[PDB]
Paper text:
In the case of morphine, there are multiple cellular adaptations that contribute to the development of analgesic tolerance following chronic exposure. Overactivation of [name]-containing N-methyl-d-Aspartate receptors is thought to play a key role in mechanisms underlying cellular adaptation that takes place in the development of analgesic tolerance.
To ascertain the binding site and pose for EU93-108, we utilized protein crystallography and X-ray diffraction to solve the structure of the isolated [name]-[name] ATD in complex with EU93-108 at 2.85 Å resolution. The crystal structure revealed the binding site of EU93-108 at the [name]-[name] ATD heterodimer interface, which is similar to that of EU93-31 and ifenprodil. The phenyl group, the piperazine group, and the difluorophenyl group are in van der Walls contacts with residues such as [name]-Pro78, -Phe176, -Pro177, -Ile111, and -Phe114 and [name]-Phe113, -Ile133, and -Leu135. EU93-108 has similar sets of polar interactions as EU93-3167 but not ifenprodil. EU93-108 was tested at 10 μM and inhibition of [name] was approximately 18-fold higher than that of the other NMDAR subunits, confirming that it is selective for [name]. As anticipated, EU93-108 was also an effective inhibitor of human diheteromeric [name] receptors (h2B/h2B) with an IC50 of 260 nM (197, 347 nM 95% CI; n = 10) and with a residual current remaining at 10 μM EU93-108 of 12% (8.5, 16% 95%CI; n = 10).
Author numbering:
A (entry chain A): 23 to 97, 102 to 186, 209 to 407
B (entry chain B): 32 to 394
The structure:
């Protein structure tokens, strides 16, 4: 007679479902479970947003889950899960979603994630501008949420060493950007930072080729999106970009996420007057009373010995101490030249070569 | 003329007959096309109830649009309907209750329109009041409830372009997604000096804020709170934590009654589809199923939106804002009196505030 406590998940595949059950199984062993004992409940992504929202109700909230884990769908979004769960104030944990929008508490009020948003790449840029004493940078940005996200996050780090001599924004969809790029040429700053989708970076990459702005002189510093798929195809040689380490290992993040959540469950039932979440959607319109506290507990969990590193959340419930590979395009091969360990840059013995040749 | 399906959803005990009787003008529809309305009743307003219901209706019948009314203080219904609207590409009009409560940032694909003031309309109104009674020093409290930045932005935008001399002391932001066992909302609230206080949040959030603001002496005399429509919500329900002398804007069921609203809902959907058949020789086909909106999506758009926003009927201007609000609604200022009753105290029309009192009597 321990109290059974359900944790839910919506995951890519059945293998991932089995990984999730196992992770919970092992949390029960690892932990002292006379009082409370977790139980895994799961489904995979439904084919559209409406069935997704009904499945959360039918399959998960009917089992009175205390929290819901959510992978990003393969080849559809976490949004209907955030929404449906958010209605009751059941916490949602994103395993693989990097879009910045989910850091907005007005939309996504019960959402944490074990991967950082894309906007947090600005931390790594900043630390590199210190390390490689780039004090004067031009900043090119897609006028969409994801682009503005990144701008704000850097400007915080600049605006209270380095400084941004201008910030240019373009309308996602534009292919002739030589209006914009001519504006970046006439400035004295040679370092260029881009936040753009895969297709928008493609557009930029060519327009900037055409103005010989890809040549020696110039440093190009970029994120993961802008060295993926077709952005990689037309990218200048010497570019520097990022790859979140394990950022797509759903299985790894299932592991760490279960670990954190089980910790936080056990810490929650140290407290008094803990109410159960609602059993099912139907006829249930009041929030879960304890959902906002459980959120607080999670939000200030620390797991230091995690498969993906050191688990902590910032105030938005985004992952902190995420690690990235620093990637340099040399002879149209993407080479790791360094890593961000979560706080420190660590150069490796592979030498960087910049646009031009640069020794 | 050919018949389009319209569903009318009513949540909570309903003058079902007075509504059926105010669409007595079935032969008031001389357009290209004629409504086939079908009243539905719902007992429940959770996400599942609403979705399965509207989706059943969609795969029983051929629904061109939905008119939704409820009796709840449940601003989430607005969000749920928006989502449904955008997923299924389907006009939903939220005419009353939760359905009409401000939903800031609807989808790009939404066909969801609400009867009610915009956030900005109400923020404006709130300044005309404070002008009138020459209240010029004031602070703002909000939560993260969507629209909070639109609110502070319309305020700030207005006061910093003003021959008048406004003096916004403080602007607060309260995080109610996290629990308050450390008294952080307390601390942030003590910080307040101002005589006036604009409060942007939900009715549920308000009750707690006020419970807190009370115990730190901010509901006393020489503090006036002003709140938007959605904090008053349903005026026949008045939480005890609400302080007396609270002021609110309101498009609750005052002059514009539910059956009127239903009738104009059906008007708007029918005339908008009329004008689109009349100018394109087709209207968009009701979606067989919402259990297949993934595939049938190149085949759909929210084309009908341009015709929904610009309607008149029996020569009344029923235009919608581009945010899917009502363009010019007659708002009613209201005051919580000493018997704990929302009493009218003002009427906003032809963009002109028209108060009852000259000075405020004391409750
Ligand atoms: C700091 S404060 O306490 O966070 N205030 C605050 C902030 C944001 C709030 O709502 C934001 C939302 O979008 C939440 N909603 C929940 C309901 N919703 C939804 C939509 C479609 C569904 F199908 C469904 F099931 C649920 C959509 C998302 C409400 C209150
Ligand atoms: C993903 O993570 C798991 C650790 O849980 C590991 O077994 C596997 O090697 C990883 N896969 C890749 C491609 O790194
Ligand atoms: C809604 O409640 C009414 C009144 O009791 C009832 O007649 C109707 O069958 C109910 N609908 C459902 C779906 O339970
Ligand atoms: C809206 O209505 C009237 C005529 O129907 C006209 O003044 C205006 O051009 C219309 N606007 C449109 C079609 O955008
Ligand atoms: Na979050």
């Amino acid at each position: 007679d321990p109290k059974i406590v359900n944790i839910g998940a919506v995951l890519s595949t059945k293998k991932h479902e089995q990984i999730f059950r196992e992770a919970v199984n092992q949390a029960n062993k690892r932990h002292f479970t006379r009082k409370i004992q977790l139980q895994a409940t799961s489904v995979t992504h439904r084919p559209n947003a409406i069935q997704m929202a009904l499945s959360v109700c039918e399959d998960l909230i009917s089992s009175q889950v205390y929290a819901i884990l959510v992978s990003h769908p393969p080849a559809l979004t976490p949004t209907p899960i955030s929404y449906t769960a958010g209605f009751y104030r059941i916490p949602v944990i994103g395993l693989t979603t990097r879009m910045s929008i989910y850091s907005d508490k007005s939309i996504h009020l019960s959402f944490l994630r074990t991967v950082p948003p894309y906007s947090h790449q600005a931390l790594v840029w900043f630390e590199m501008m210190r390390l490689f004493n780039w004090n004067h940078v031009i900043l090119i940005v897609s006028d969409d949420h994801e682009g503005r996200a990144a701008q704000k996050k850097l400007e915080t780090l600049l605006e209270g060493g380095p400084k941004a001599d201008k910030v240019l924004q373009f309308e996602p969809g534009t292919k002739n950007l030589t209006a914009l790029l001519l504006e970046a040429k006439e400035l004295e700053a040679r370092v260029i930072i881009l936040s753009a989708s895969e297709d928008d970076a493609t557009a930029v990459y060519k327009s900037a080729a055409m103005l010989d702005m890809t040549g020696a002189g110039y440093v190009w510093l970029v994120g993961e999106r802008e060295i993926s798929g077709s952005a990689l195809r037309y990218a200048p040689d010497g570019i520097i970009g990022l790859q979140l380490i394990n950022g797509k290992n759903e299985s790894a993040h299932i592991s760490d996420a279960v670990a954190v959540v089980a910790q936080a469950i056990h810490e929650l039932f140290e407290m008094e007057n803990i109410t159960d979440p609602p059993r099912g959607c139907v006829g249930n319109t009041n929030i879960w009373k304890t959902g906002p506290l459980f959120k607080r507990v999670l939000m200030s969990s620390k797991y230091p010995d995690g498969v993906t590193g050191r688990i902590e959340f910032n105030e938005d419930g985004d992952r902190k101490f995420a690690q990235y590979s620093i990637m340099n395009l040399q002879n149209r091969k993407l080479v790791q030249v360094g890593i961000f360990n979560g706080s420190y840059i660590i150069q490796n013995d592979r030498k960087i070569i910049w646009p031009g040749g640069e020794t | 003329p050919p018949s389009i399906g319209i569903a009318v959803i009513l949540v909570g005990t309903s003058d079902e007959v007075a509504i059926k009787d105010a669409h007595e003008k079935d032969d008031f529809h001389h357009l290209s096309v004629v409504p086939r309305v079908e009243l539905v009743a719902m007992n429940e307003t959770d996400p599942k109830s609403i979705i399965t219901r509207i989706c059943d209706l969609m795969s029983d019948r051929k629904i061109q649009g939905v008119v939704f009314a409820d009796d709840t203080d449940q601003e989430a219904i607005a969000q749920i309907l928006d989502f449904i609207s955008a997923q299924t590409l389907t006009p939903i009009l939220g005419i009353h209750g939760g359905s009409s409560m401000i939903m800031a940032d609807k989808d790009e694909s939404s066909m969801f329109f609400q009867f009610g003031p915009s956030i900005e309309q109400q923020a404006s109104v709130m300044l005309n009041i404070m002008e009138e009674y020459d209240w010029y020093i004031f602070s703002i409290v909000t939560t993260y409830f969507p629209g909070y930045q639109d609110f502070v932005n319309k305020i700030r935008s207005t006061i910093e372009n003003s021959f008048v001399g406004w003096e916004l002391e403080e602007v607060l932001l309260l995080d109610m997604s996290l629990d308050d066992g450390d008294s952080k909302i307390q601390n942030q609230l003590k910080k307040l000096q101002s005589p006036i206080i604009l409060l942007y949040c939900t009715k549920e959030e308000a009750t707690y804020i006020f419970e807190v603001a009370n115990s730190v002496g901010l509901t006393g005399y020489g503090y006036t709170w002003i709140v938007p429509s959605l904090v008053a919500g349903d005026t026949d329900t008045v939480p005890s934590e609400f302080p007396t002398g609270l002021i609110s804007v309101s498009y609750d069921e005052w002059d514009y009654g539910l059956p009127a609203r239903v009738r104009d809902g059906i008007a708007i959907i029918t005339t908008a589809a009329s004008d689109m058949l009349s100018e394109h020789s087709f209207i968009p086909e009701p979606k067989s199923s919402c259990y297949n909106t993934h595939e049938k999506r190149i085949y759909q758009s929210n084309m009908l939106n341009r015709y929904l926003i610009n309607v008149t009927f029996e020569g009344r201007d029923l235009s919608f804002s581009e945010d899917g609000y009502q363009m010019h609604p007659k708002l009613v200022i209201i005051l919580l009196n000493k018997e704990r009753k929302w009493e009218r105290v003002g009427k906003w029309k032809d963009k002109s505030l028209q108060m009852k009192y000259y000075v405020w009597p004391r409750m």
